[PDB]
Motif scaffolding. Structure first.
Motif, short mmCIF file in Angstrom:
data_model
loop_
_atom_site.label_atom_id
_atom_site.label_comp_id
_atom_site.label_asym_id
_atom_site.label_seq_id
_atom_site.Cartn_x
_atom_site.Cartn_y
_atom_site.Cartn_z
N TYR B 239 31.14 71.19 57.45
CA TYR B 239 30.63 70.85 58.80
C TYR B 239 29.98 72.12 59.32
CZ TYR B 239 32.58 66.14 59.68
OH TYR B 239 32.86 64.80 59.66
N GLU B 240 28.85 72.03 60.00
CA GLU B 240 28.19 73.23 60.58
C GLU B 240 29.08 73.75 61.71
OE1 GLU B 240 24.91 71.70 64.05
OE2 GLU B 240 24.45 71.60 61.86
N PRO B 241 28.97 75.04 62.07
CA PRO B 241 29.74 75.56 63.19
C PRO B 241 29.33 74.85 64.49
CG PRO B 241 28.68 77.35 61.94
CD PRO B 241 28.04 76.04 61.52
N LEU B 242 30.30 74.65 65.37
CA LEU B 242 30.05 74.16 66.75
C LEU B 242 29.89 75.38 67.66
CD1 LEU B 242 30.03 71.39 68.25
CD2 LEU B 242 32.29 72.05 69.09
N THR B 243 28.79 75.49 68.39
CA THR B 243 28.47 76.62 69.30
C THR B 243 28.82 76.22 70.73
OG1 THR B 243 26.21 75.93 69.67
CG2 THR B 243 26.58 77.35 67.79
N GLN B 244 28.84 77.19 71.64
CA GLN B 244 29.06 76.91 73.09
C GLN B 244 27.91 76.05 73.62
OE1 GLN B 244 31.86 77.51 74.93
NE2 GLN B 244 30.81 76.25 76.44
N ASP B 245 26.70 76.25 73.10
CA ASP B 245 25.51 75.43 73.41
C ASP B 245 25.82 73.96 73.11
OD1 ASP B 245 24.74 78.28 72.27
OD2 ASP B 245 22.90 77.58 73.35
N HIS B 246 26.41 73.70 71.94
CA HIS B 246 26.81 72.35 71.49
C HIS B 246 27.81 71.78 72.49
CE1 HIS B 246 25.57 73.42 67.14
NE2 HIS B 246 24.55 72.92 67.84
N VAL B 247 28.82 72.59 72.85
CA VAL B 247 29.86 72.21 73.85
C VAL B 247 29.16 71.85 75.17
CG1 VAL B 247 31.93 72.91 75.13
CG2 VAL B 247 31.66 73.57 72.73
N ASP B 248 28.18 72.64 75.62
CA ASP B 248 27.49 72.38 76.91
C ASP B 248 26.71 71.07 76.83
OD1 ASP B 248 28.64 74.72 77.75
OD2 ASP B 248 26.79 75.91 77.47
#
Ligand code: M0C
Ligand code: M0C
Ligand code: CL
Lengths: 306, 306
Positions: B239-248
């Protein structure tokens, strides 16, 4: 190569979508020549819908009570009548974008594209099957009523579905364009449930042929079966019976691959009895039954529409 | 209710599709204003394609060598140039059906609709993702080259993909409309393979929110995780990393459902470590990663296009 759930190009239908408002109820209409077709419950308030007398509510409406808009243009209603569960609004303008078209009542097992609309504006397009229990597994929010399903044959749009309602389990029910419901559903807010569904066997075999064509062949065994001994196993797994008609319809895919229909039936029998042991077919971990033999041929031979 | 892989309505793009023939090579072109955009390998014979000098082959072509047809109408080519891997044919007629449009280069993870065409005629429409390895899982036969992918924002068609080629494993590669390839692919017939793909994590979480919205909630556990302890487990399962951008970006769906992104991350972590024990989510036995947060909102809120 590749195999995708593929809808028909929607442009011919987009040009026919209008917004119909009657009082506080707005939904979508289909504008063909000088007639707009919509679900007849446009004439209800959200409480009328428990048990409406449609013939009565319609008596009480004048042509001007129907506000039909096609983009920023208001169309003037000059006539109105009911045909089963569908309203027909005669308008004063023939739709200049009316494509060549037919109204068809499709059979259980057959697929079509849905052009999902809100406020007479298209949201998106997806492919569906008419389930053996006369429901479709759609995506519709409040506002989608009057959205239509269709097939394209080269230049001719074959309208087969108009959206009316959502049943328990989030499946959908509606009418042909003559306003007769598919299955036993009525356009009233009461307790209605879909019959238990069945898997469309002929469609699962068509999808297995698609897998072979794309090079996914792990599930082919060295055996055959009789039609009779296949339909006994099928019955256990809630698969509809396979008829000789079904076998004849699978002729092209059978000829293209060199696999006899009854040999593929032997492979499907093993998959049903043993499951897939964590393997996929065409990316999928479940057997797919929403591609017809025609859908497989179209996609794996590149049939186009003008 | 319901959740379907849903394409954008195709009508705006259908009006732009033409057939480009150069000698014995026919494929599809995109007619916007007075320019037709097509893959530059229209100028090759099927043997030129092993290692073509495109700048050279093009030198040798006059405007009349390009036969552009839009239905039964021939369009007269009055100019021609190469921009990276895309040909631009200036024609003597501006396309009267040119929609409002943009050329966008999308990011890995983003979805779009493909309008599959043969001989300048639309075959069908389906939704795709730009994979982390810069391929798409398409359905294209020989003849589909020049087919385009797009997004619609209300009235504006955002063209992001033009189809060029098919890689081993039956996945597809092509260019933005400025003719730069997505990923490391070159328009020549040689050994090229997709990098190993990854699962688009933010998209799997968006799809889990879609399941909750539709009432499929069995997989919600009572736990939370930190972003760090989620991305360690994610890494094991490719799975690709989840970033804070993704969370937002998941903010709207999180707010609508009252489930914190890091709580949903806890539920996905359990699904990855324990599998689904033969259960389905939204009809599916595998986690789906080709719905963006925007795609989920659009479908579960009914966004439309004019
Ligand atoms: C349709 O009327 C619509 O889109 N409208 C905008 C104003 C009217 C609507 C579509 C539904 C709503 C949720 N998802 C859909 O696809 N259809 C109805 O609301 C439908 C009208 C009433 C009651 N309808 C139902 O769909 C209901 N179903 C049932 O009663 C039943 F299936 F259980 F039988 C509800 C609202 C409970 C889903 C009538 C059938 C006339
Ligand atoms: C495209 O050219 C097309 O549709 N045409 C009609 C005449 C040209 C075609 C589409 C492909 C064919 C099968 N499915 C598709 O989507 N593209 C090409 O043939 C492409 C042209 C040559 C070689 N191409 C390939 O797609 C090849 N791939 C590869 O070499 C590689 F992926 F392995 F690298 C083949 C044909 C092996 C699939 C060029 C890249 C210029
Ligand atoms: Cl699946």
């Amino acid at each position: 190569s590749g195999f995708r759930k593929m809808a028909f190009p929607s442009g011919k239908v987009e040009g026919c979508m209008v917004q119909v408002t009657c009082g506080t109820t707005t939904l979508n209409g289909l504008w063909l020549d000088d007639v707009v077709y919509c679900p007849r419950h446009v004439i209800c308030t959200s409480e009328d819908m428990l048990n409406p007398n449609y013939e009565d509510l319609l008596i009480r409406k004048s042509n001007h009570n129907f506000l039909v808009q096609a983009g920023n243009v208001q169309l003037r209603v000059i006539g109105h009548s009911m045909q089963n569960c569908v309203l027909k609004l005669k308008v004063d303008t023939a739709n200049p974008k009316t494509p060549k078209y037919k109204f068809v009542r499709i059979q259980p097992g057959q697929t079509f594209s849905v052009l999902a609309c809100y406020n007479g504006s298209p949201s998106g397009v997806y492919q569906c099957a008419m389930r053996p229990n006369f429901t479709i597994k759609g995506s519709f929010l409040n506002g989608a009523c009057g959205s239509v399903g269709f097939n394209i044959d080269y230049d001719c749009v074959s309208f087969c579905y108009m959206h009316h309602m959502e049943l328990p389990t989030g499946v959908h029910a509606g009418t042909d364009l003559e306003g007769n419901f598919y299955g036993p559903f009525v356009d009233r807010q009461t307790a209605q449930a879909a019959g238990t569904d069945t898997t469309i066997t002929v469609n699962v075999l068509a999808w297995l042929y698609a897998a072979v064509i794309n090079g996914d062949r792990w599930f082919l065994n060295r055996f055959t079966t009789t039609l009779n001994d296949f339909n006994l196993v099928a019955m256990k797994y809630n698969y509809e019976p396979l008829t000789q008609d079904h076998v004849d319809i699978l002729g092209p895919l059978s000829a293209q691959t060199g696999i006899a229909v009854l040999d593929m039936c032997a492979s499907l029998k093993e998959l049903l009895q043993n499951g897939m042991n964590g393997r996929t077919i065409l990316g999928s971990a479940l057997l797919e039954d929403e591609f017809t033999p025609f859908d497989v041929v179209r996609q794996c031979s590149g049939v186009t529409f003008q």
